[PDB]
Curated annotation (Swiss-Prot):
Molecular-function annotations in GO: calcium ion binding; molecular function inhibitor activity; potassium channel inhibitor activity; protease binding; serine-type endopeptidase inhibitor activity; sulfate binding; zymogen binding
Physiological role: Inhibits trypsin, kallikrein, chymotrypsin, and plasmin.
Annotated source species: Bos taurus
The keyword Secreted is annotated on this UniProt entry: yes
Taxonomic path: Eukaryota, Metazoa, Chordata, Craniata, Vertebrata
Coiled coil: none
Superkingdom to which the source organism belongs: Eukaryota
Site for Reactive bond for trypsin, residues: 15-16
GO BP terms, alphabetized: negative regulation of platelet aggregation; negative regulation of serine-type endopeptidase activity; negative regulation of thrombin-activated receptor signaling pathway; trypsinogen activation
Section of the entire sequence shown: 36 to 93 of 100
Keyword Ribosomal protein: no
UniProt protein name: Pancreatic trypsin inhibitor
Cellular localisation: Secreted
Span of domain BPTI/Kunitz inhibitor: 5-55
UniProt keyword terms in alphabetical order: Disulfide bond, Pharmaceutical, Protease inhibitor, Secreted, Serine protease inhibitor, Signal
Disulfide bonds: 5-55, 14-38, 30-51
């Protein structure tokens, strides 16, 4: 599983409220979170299906 999949979600400094997905490795689930629109990290997906394919494990 890529190492960036183990990071907590990162909202960042932007003032937007954009609903994105992160992979929660401890839970084993893709979950939603509020992203501010600036300086996303890689554990920040546009969909659940993308989060799971990238971070869900082989």
């Amino acid at each position: 599983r890529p190492d960036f999949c183990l990071e907590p979600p990162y909202t960042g400094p932007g003032k937007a409220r954009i609903i994105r997905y992160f992979y929660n490795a401890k839970a084993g689930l893709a979950q939603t979170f509020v992203y501010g629109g600036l300086r996303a990290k890689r554990n920040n997906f546009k969909s659940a299906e993308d989060a799971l394919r990238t971070c869900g494990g082989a």
